[PDB]
Ligand binder design. Structure first.
Ligand SMILES: Nc1nc2c(ncn2[C@@H]2O[C@H](COP(=O)(O)OP(=O)(O)OP(=O)(O)O)[C@@H](O)[C@H]2O)c(=O)[nH]1
Ligand SMILES: [Mg+2]
Lengths: 68, 37, 199, 147, 188, 50, 227, 67
RNA sequence: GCAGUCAAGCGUUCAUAGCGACAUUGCUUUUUGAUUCUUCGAUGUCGGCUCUUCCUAUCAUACCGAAGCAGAAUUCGGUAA
RNA sequence: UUCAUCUAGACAGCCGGACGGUGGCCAUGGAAGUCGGAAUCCGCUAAGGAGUGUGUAACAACUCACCGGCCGAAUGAACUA
């Protein structure tokens, strides 16, 4: 009863190894992994198992998944 | 001459005859038509 | 602009009215005499030149109005040129046609000796023609002037040689003799005003 | 008893000054404090500055002058602006005059103490036509002859 | 320059407990409880372990990071208000007229009533906020003490009480009257 | 003309206000002689009248 | 924009820089082979004629002061780099404000001197109550008939910084309740020391302490504990 | 009246209680108000303010050139 | 206004080929408030009775600010039609 | 954009020192670092100006400019658009 009940506010956060879904574009619905962050908006992704080529991409074209 | 700076500091028996003469002088002293542009 | 800010703060005096001048050396008691005789905010600090301008206070004797003009206190040494603080005294003595209270300290605590007090009184003496001088000894409470030696009391006899003068004893702790000083200051001046009225 | 202290500057003839506030609080003396002051400035000019310190205990007479001040360079002369800008022969005369003042001046030898009394001479003519700053930058006399 | 994240740290001592839902902050400890609403500031709080809590702003400009230091400064004053509490002492110096200060209760509202300020007949009422208790100083001449849990309840109620006695249309170099704040100290 | 009168109405507020040191009284003239230096007093007011 | 505007001045004195540091880097390494004794002295609070006493009293000594890390730079903080040997242990000790001493008279005279040398400075001891009347600049030390009333300029300094309640009737300064500033056996506060500073009460004695000694020819670290 | 009377009233009474707080908090704010007047003062009040603000930068840089 | 002086800037790189803000000096009818009684060609038609409305660049009244602002009075300055 | 200062301790701020010859010459009713004119030099120093400000009738007292103790990452000035 003497604890701090402060909430955590859980967020999917970009990092190296976050797997993502590509919502629009040529690939459009294939999983891929963020390899390296470039800046605030551009990331370097790749998924070779699904078939998306290794490429830079913008974060507006991608949607983050909970899996890591 | 006067103020916050005030550098001047200086301006008996001969002052007696003068100021007694200065005072007695003082009581002796007191006792549009046709123009246009 | 700077002579406008200083000319408002000068005291209001009338030369034709009956005044009295309180003149003497610095650090004597002429400020403390003024504080007990009338209502005025004049500082009583124990150093030489406290008042640098003429300070005026008003009192009442026999249903009238008297004003008491304080002086800054003077050193005569060359008698021709003098400090502008000290020069304000001399025209307050020369022009103002009313009695002057020669305020002498026959005691220890001043910047000057007794011998410097009497020599100045003969120097100012030509200003004292038409003015009916009264001399008042302050600080008599601690010295009791029968202490004084026989030859330097003969200097007090030399004070009484200018025709109209008179000596009184006073202090500034007992408040009845500070009253009795101004009564002879008032009654002697009424001898001069009434005689000038009957002409 | 006790042991207090007072000081006094200026003047040349017997007087009571600035000390009239202290003599009002302390023991009173008008003729005694004037002669105790006149004994200090005896055979000293009244025009020059003279600094003293007076210690009394129930009406004592005291007179001493420390002479660490510009009293030294003012001593070796013969008297809008009274010109103290004079020419004096410092070279050997101020060398012995530096010996009296160097009781502590907190200096190592007279070689680092004679130049400390040279800047105090910011008026006089000294030795030669010039006894000032670079006119006495070095000192090729006395020096070790005072130690 | 678009800082990627900044943070500050809130040092929670052993007495107090802090409950933070979305931006509603409650501080409960020895002397009492407090709340403060923060829906406008748009930050993120994170607990690590029971004595230290990190505030955070991700991807913010210069204005959005300058408003992150002040959220540390508000919760720390919510902490010292509950551990130590606040106490402002005021002196009310008059020149000629004795200033009569009282506490009156009209309708259960507990005002502060000032009379005879510079000879005025006007009665001024200063309302007392919730949670500030005014006591008159014992055996110290001319002193009024304000004290409570909140900074902004106490410091406002002391600032209100000195603006109610401002001298109008006169020279403030001459007329000395007024009420002033001596110093801003803690209780313990 | 309106600016021209604007400077004069300020100057008429100076030359009327100051106490006209000659013929006041030989006392009030002579406190102001020592304290205010009659020469600098009379020259500056006559400069404005010019 | 919206940056802090720094105060710009017009005073005569200017800043030193790095070139005064490297001189003290040289003067310490020069004094090692020149003199024979290395004395390190912890002296936190100092007074300048106290320091100017010790300098002029000892011609054979050289009292060299500076920053700590410059003294570690010159004596050599690590054992691998040092000018003369067996020196890295004694430079470990100088944690406070320290100034090195380089004498050549005796090891007995130096350790005897500082116990014999004692002065008096500010307290930073005995208790003091203020009378409930006119306060004086001596503050009840000497009799108040000879005392001087305090200057009223530092009276707003007293009401705000010293926390002492002073309300002023006339040209002097008055308090109405008796107020004690300190009690004996208590560590004095910085507000309590500044009351004793304005009152001019330096009644706590001062002595300088020394912590270690080195001898060049013997080349060994000597630690002596006197306070 | 009755020569200088405010400076005697300063000595024997004090300025005020918070006269040293308020004055010190003036020039703490005057760094913020000079930038506040330059963004306000629409129409010839922004002209004569900019003429006197530029006359102060010239008068201060001459003192730095002096030494 | 003209004629100087001083120099942060400007002039393809630029002190000295040449410009020049901010300051300041030149007298523009006499340094001691005495006066100057000087209206110096308006070549052109609107002015006033009644009545309404609108700007602010505020003469008064509202509230503030600053000055030797003791009050009393009175100035500078802001928001406001 | 060029110039600087720095993790071997910068910048900010608390804390400590901020001295001796000295109350430097003249000025003066008093002017001691500061109402002022001319000045303005040395000693010891880590550092301490014949001295930026507060102001006592003078002094005292405080301040920064100068160095040093703590804390542990960069920071300041000048401009360009
Ligand atoms: N023993 C004694 N001392 C007095 C007496 N009157 C004044 N004093 C002293 O005078 C000191 C003050 O000096 P002032 O009263 O100002 O004398 P003053 O300086 O010549 O007067 P001003 O020149 O107008 O300032 C006080 O501290 C008293 O000690 C008195 O009657 N007896
Ligand atoms: Mg006196």
């Amino acid at each position: 009863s003497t604890d701090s009940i402060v909430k955590a506010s859980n967020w999917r956060l970009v990092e190296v190894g976050r797997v993502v879904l590509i919502k629009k574009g040529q690939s459009a619905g294939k999983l891929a992994a963020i390899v390296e962050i470039i800046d605030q908006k551009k990331v370097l992704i790749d998924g070779p198992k699904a078939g998306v080529p290794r490429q830079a991409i913008n974060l507006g074209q991608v949607v983050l998944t909970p899996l890591t | 001459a006067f103020g916050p700076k005030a550098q001047r500091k200086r301006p008996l028996e001969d002052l007696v005859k003068a100021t007694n003469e200065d005072i007695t002088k003082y009581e002796e002293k007191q006792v549009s038509k046709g123009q246009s542009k | 602009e700077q002579v406008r800010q200083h000319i408002g703060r000068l005291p209001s005096i009338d030369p034709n009215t009956r005044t009295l001048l309180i003149c003497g050396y610095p650090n004597v008691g002429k400020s403390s005499f003024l504080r007990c005789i009338t209502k005025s905010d004049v500082d009583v600090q124990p150093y030489a030149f406290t008042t640098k301008s003429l300070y005026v206070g008003h009192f009442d004797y026999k249903y009238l109005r008297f004003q008491a003009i304080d002086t800054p206190g003077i050193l005569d040494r060359p008698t021709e040129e003098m400090n502008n603080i000290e020069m304000q005294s001399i025209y307050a003595i020369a022009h103002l046609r009313s009695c002057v209270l020669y305020f002498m300290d026959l005691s220890e605590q001043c910047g000057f000796t007794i011998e410097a007090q009497v020599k100045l009184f003969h120097s100012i003496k030509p200003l004292f023609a038409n003015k009916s001088v009264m001399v008042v000894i302050n600080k008599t409470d601690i010295i009791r002037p029968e202490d004084l030696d026989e030859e330097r009391a003969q200097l007090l006899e030399s004070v009484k040689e200018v025709p109209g003068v008179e000596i009184m004893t006073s202090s500034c702790q007992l408040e009845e003799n500070v009253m009795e000083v101004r009564n002879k200051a008032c009654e002697k001046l009424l001898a001069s005003r009434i005689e000038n009225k009957l002409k | 008893x006790x042991x207090x202290x007072x000081x006094x500057x200026x003047x040349x003839x017997x007087x009571x000054x600035x000390x009239x506030x202290x003599x009002x609080x302390x023991x009173x003396x008008x003729x005694x404090x004037x002669x105790x002051x006149x004994x200090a400035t005896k055979e000293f000019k009244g025009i020059k500055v003279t600094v003293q310190l007076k210690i009394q205990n129930r009406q004592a007479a005291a007179s001493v002058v420390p002479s660490a001040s510009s009293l030294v360079i003012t001593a070796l002369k013969e008297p809008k602006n009274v010109k103290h800008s004079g020419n004096i022969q410092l070279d050997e005369i101020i060398x012995x005059x530096x010996x009296x003042x160097x009781x502590x001046x907190x200096x190592x030898x007279x070689x680092x103490x004679x130049x400390x009394x040279x800047x105090x001479x910011x008026x006089x003519x000294x030795x030669x036509x010039x006894x000032x700053x670079x006119x006495x930058x070095x000192x090729x006399x006395x020096x070790x002859x005072x130690x | 320059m678009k800082y990627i994240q900044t943070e500050q740290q809130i040092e929670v001592p052993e007495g107090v407990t802090v409950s933070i839902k979305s931006r509603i902050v409650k501080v409960v400890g020895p002397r009492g409880t407090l709340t403060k609403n923060l829906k406008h500031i748009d930050v993120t709080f994170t607990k690590v372990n029971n004595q230290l809590i990190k505030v955070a702003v991700h991807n913010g400009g210069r204005k959005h990071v300058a408003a992150l230091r002040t959220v540390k400064s508000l919760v720390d004053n919510m902490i010292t208000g509950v551990t130590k509490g606040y106490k402002y002492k005021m002196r009310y110096v008059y020149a000629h007229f004795p200033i009569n200060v009282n506490i009156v209760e009209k309708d259960g509202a507990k005002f502060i009533e000032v009379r005879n300020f510079l000879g005025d007949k006007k009665i001024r009422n200063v309302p007392v906020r919730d949670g500030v208790t005014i006591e008159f100083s014992t055996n110290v001449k001319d002193e009024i003490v304000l004290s409570g849990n909140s900074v902004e309840d106490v410091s406002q109620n002391a600032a209100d009480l000195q603006q109610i006695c401002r001298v109008r249309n006169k020279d403030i170099r001459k007329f000395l009257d007024g009420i002033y704040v001596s110093h801003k100290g803690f209780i313990t | 003309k309106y600016t021209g009168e604007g400077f004069v109405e300020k100057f008429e507020d100076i030359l009327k206000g100051f106490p006209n040191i000659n013929d006041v009284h030989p006392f009030h003239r002579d406190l102001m002689d020592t304290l205010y230096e009659k020469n600098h007093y009379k020259i500056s007011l006559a400069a404005i009248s010019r | 924009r919206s940056k802090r505007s720094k105060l710009v001045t017009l005073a005569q004195t200017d800043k030193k820089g790095r070139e005064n540091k490297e001189r003290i880097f040289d003067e310490v390494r020069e004094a090692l082979d020149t003199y024979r004794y290395v004395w390190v002295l912890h002296l936190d609070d100092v007074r300048t004629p106290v320091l100017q006493e010790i300098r002029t009293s000892w011609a054979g000594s050289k009292l060299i002061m500076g920053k700590r890390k410059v003294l570690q730079k010159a004596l050599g903080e690590k054992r691998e780099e040092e000018y003369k040997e067996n020196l890295y242990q004694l430079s470990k000790l100088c944690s406070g404000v320290t100034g090195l001493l380089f004498t050549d008279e005796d090891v007995n005279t130096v350790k005897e001197y500082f116990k014999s040398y004692v002065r008096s400075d500010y307290s930073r001891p005995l208790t003091f109550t203020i009378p409930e009347g006119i306060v004086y600049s001596r503050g009840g030390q000497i009799p108040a008939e000879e005392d001087v009333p305090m200057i009223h300029s530092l009276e707003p300094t007293m009401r705000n910084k010293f926390e002492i309640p002073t309300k002023i009737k006339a040209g002097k300064i008055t308090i109405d309740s008796p107020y004690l500033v300190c009690t004996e056996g208590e560590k004095l506060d910085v507000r309590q020391a500044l009351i004793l500073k304005q009152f001019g009460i330096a009644a706590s004695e001062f002595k300088v302490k020394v912590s270690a000694y080195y001898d060049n020819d013997s080349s060994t670290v000597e630690s002596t504990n006197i306070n | 009246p009755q020569n200088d009377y405010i400076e005697r009233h300063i000595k024997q009474h004090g300025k005020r209680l918070d006269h040293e707080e308020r004055k010190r908090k003036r020039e703490a704010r005057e760094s913020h108000k000079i930038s506040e007047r330059a963004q306000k003062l629409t129409g010839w009040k922004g002209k004569q303010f900019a003429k006197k603000r530029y006359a102060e930068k010239v008068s201060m840089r001459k003192k730095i050139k002096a030494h």
